[PDB]
Amino acid sequence: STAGKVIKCKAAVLWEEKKPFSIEEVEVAPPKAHEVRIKMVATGICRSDDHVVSGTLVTPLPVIAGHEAAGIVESIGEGVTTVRPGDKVIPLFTPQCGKCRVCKHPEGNFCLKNDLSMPRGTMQDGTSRFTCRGKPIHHFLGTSTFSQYTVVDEISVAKIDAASPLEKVCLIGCGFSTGYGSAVKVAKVTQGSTCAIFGLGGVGLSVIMGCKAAGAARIIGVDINKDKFAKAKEVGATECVNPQDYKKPIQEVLTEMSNGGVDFSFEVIGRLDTMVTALSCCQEAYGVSVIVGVPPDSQNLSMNPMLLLSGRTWKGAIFGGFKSKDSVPKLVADFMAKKFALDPLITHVLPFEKINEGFDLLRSGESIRTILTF
Amino acid sequence: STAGKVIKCKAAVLWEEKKPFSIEEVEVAPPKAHEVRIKMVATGICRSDDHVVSGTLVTPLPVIAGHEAAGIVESIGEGVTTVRPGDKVIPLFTPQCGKCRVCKHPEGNFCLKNDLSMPRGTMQDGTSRFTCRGKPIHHFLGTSTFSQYTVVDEISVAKIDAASPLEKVCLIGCGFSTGYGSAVKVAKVTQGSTCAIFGLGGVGLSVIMGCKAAGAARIIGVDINKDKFAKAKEVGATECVNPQDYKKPIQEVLTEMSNGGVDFSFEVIGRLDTMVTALSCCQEAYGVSVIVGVPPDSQNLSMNPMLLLSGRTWKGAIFGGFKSKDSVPKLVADFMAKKFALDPLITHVLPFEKINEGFDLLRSGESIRTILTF
Numbered sequence A, B: 001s002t003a004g005k006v007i008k009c010k011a012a013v014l015w016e017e018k019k020p021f022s023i024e025e026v027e028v029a030p031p032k033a034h035e036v037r038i039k040m041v042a043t044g045i046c047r048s049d050d051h052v053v054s055g056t057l058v059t060p061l062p063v064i065a066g067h068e069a070a071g072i073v074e075s076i077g078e079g080v081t082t083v084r085p086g087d088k089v090i091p092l093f094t095p096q097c098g099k100c101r102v103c104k105h106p107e108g109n110f111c112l113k114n115d116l117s118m119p120r121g122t123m124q125d126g127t128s129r130f131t132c133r134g135k136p137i138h139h140f141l142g143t144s145t146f147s148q149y150t151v152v153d154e155i156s157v158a159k160i161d162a163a164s165p166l167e168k169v170c171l172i173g174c175g176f177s178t179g180y181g182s183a184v185k186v187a188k189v190t191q192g193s194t195c196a197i198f199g200l201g202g203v204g205l206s207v208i209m210g211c212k213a214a215g216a217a218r219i220i221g222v223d224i225n226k227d228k229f230a231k232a233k234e235v236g237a238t239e240c241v242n243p244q245d246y247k248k249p250i251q252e253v254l255t256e257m258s259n260g261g262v263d264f265s266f267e268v269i270g271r272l273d274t275m276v277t278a279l280s281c282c283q284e285a286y287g288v289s290v291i292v293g294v295p296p297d298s299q300n301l302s303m304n305p306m307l308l309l310s311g312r313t314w315k316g317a318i319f320g321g322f323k324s325k326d327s328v329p330k331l332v333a334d335f336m337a338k339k340f341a342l343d344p345l346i347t348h349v350l351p352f353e354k355i356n357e358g359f360d361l362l363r364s365g366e367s368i369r370t371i372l373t374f
Ligand SMILES: NC(=O)c1ccc[n+]([C@@H]2O[C@H](COP(=O)([O-])OP(=O)([O-])OC[C@H]3O[C@@H](n4cnc5c(N)[nH+]cnc54)[C@H](O)[C@@H]3O)[C@@H](O)[C@H]2O)c1
Pocket: A046, A047, A048, A051, A174, A175, A178, A198, A199, A200, A201, A202, A203, A204, A222, A223, A224, A225, A228, A243, A268, A269, A270, A271, A274, A291, A292, A293, A294, A295, A317, A318, A319, A320, A368, B309
């Protein structure tokens, strides 16, 4: 039995920015009241994890990163009511406490207990469950999925179907749900509309899936890497454009293509310039643009507010607008019911021990999602 | 009869920026096909007319400004079907051609025939109906209401109730409809919500009217001129705040007052800084901010897109989002049925000949709306 005891296990520790993960032994404390210790089964490599490595996202180091995952409950702390040992679960990088003003709001999902806004890198109680080489190691987004075992707060975990394939449904923990919800819930893409998606990685492809599911008539993928176009078309893009092929700015190209601007645009990269381009390419009177990408820490964009005064709507969201604990089990049930596909996002499957190789596939442009298996 | 003849009449001509208007004789050509010549009865002084004087808003000079008005049709050109001589009318500074993609869209109002995005200062045919001292004089927004007679395109005029009091309903041509619609149509303010309005002039008071009509529980007025607070409370503000009273930035004050951010905020001034402040003060996960104020020409704001990524919605609108020709007659009908009040906006009345005094009253801070009578 491991319940109640410190577990020594393998994890991928990030000791400093811009260096490889170190795969080594950590100690994982047992869960305290209202905490859940999970044996990980599969975790995806999301660009936001790479942002921690690159310094694009600032969070306390050293850290166990990883936020897109699935596993099996090993043990529960006193007072836990929503999961039990043996349950398949997805950690929730956006919590759902159910009590704050956001959780109670019909359209809010960015629960006030999150660790995104002002990251502390801890459990809810302000302490860590992880040590390595005698040193405390920070959590990441309350999840820390790059470890054989993690500990999460109850508000940061959802129980999912016992028959789920965890090596696929881990994507519902971040990239699929974020893109799909950005289309269907945050933008509320309409039947017959024209959409433009900037960035054709895992998240952008999931935005395309949602735009097709919503009945869009035209779905224009935009990427500087033309190797991304074939899969974008497979999942619903009606055409793809590479800004580098054009003498004119791409907002002008997209405005011309759409006979005066698109209905819905999405920034799914994380650049200031493409956030402003994406806003500009939606129709000036009734267009909607959604920011999905995460831009570099503490940098401001510049824009002319006449883009908004004419009638455009500009919004962003975390995790596709989904209230996380309510939505994750339903998404997994919908996947089990064949309502959407996840295989198109999965290009590589590697053992956890190859985490660094997985990040190198992302950075080289070669992968969409690598799933690491423990 | 004057039909088919040039009319000589008085107008207020702006020859140069940062100068008084010149009240002097102009020649007003008869209407061409699908044009309407109107004998003006009343026009309001809106801050956007002052923007032309100050160079905040760039439009070709020399010009006959004025865009908030009501009058009586003197004559119609060939092919006009929607008004007749003797009808009471409101010129529409935002046209409604009824044929473009925006006019056909359920939520668009910024008709593609507008002369706002890139002003030419002409009729739809690219010419002028005005001569002064033998020189052609530009139009403004297709309306040019600071004249005893104007000529407008048919898509830029709406027929209104024959029993309408034109010295009141002129405000439906700009400031009332803009503010009220910005609350009720663009933001879609909800019952029980908390709203913050930056700027308590005629437009911001009209926003407050709309937030009260929509059932808001708290309506916080924000102005650096505390003389504006009494009227804001009369029309529905529950409290008023002056940024100059506080050590901390007003977005922080409003976030504290609203226990974590407001549901709806409105920028109703025309400053880049208060557009960002207004966005920031709305709740980060579900707040909505609407830009109503007109920014200084060609200047960009700077903002951190994390404000949007957490879930805020940022939008702007012209004319309260109202499709102008459909909506103006209904708004007049509702005013006649006492569905809303206009008198709180009217602080001064002057004859047209005293236009410059009217602008002095606006610039001093003393007036809300001065109504000029021809
Ligand atoms: N809002 C959220 O909740 C959330 C969740 C998941 C991911 N993200 C962010 O979303 C973004 C995309 O993540 P991902 O899909 O995993 O990343 P990814 O797989 O790196 O995809 C990014 C795509 O952008 C393309 N690209 C790069 N520069 C340009 C350019 N100038 N123009 C057009 N295309 C360009 C690039 O070739 C690649 O295919 C990242 O910034 C993530 O951090 C946000």
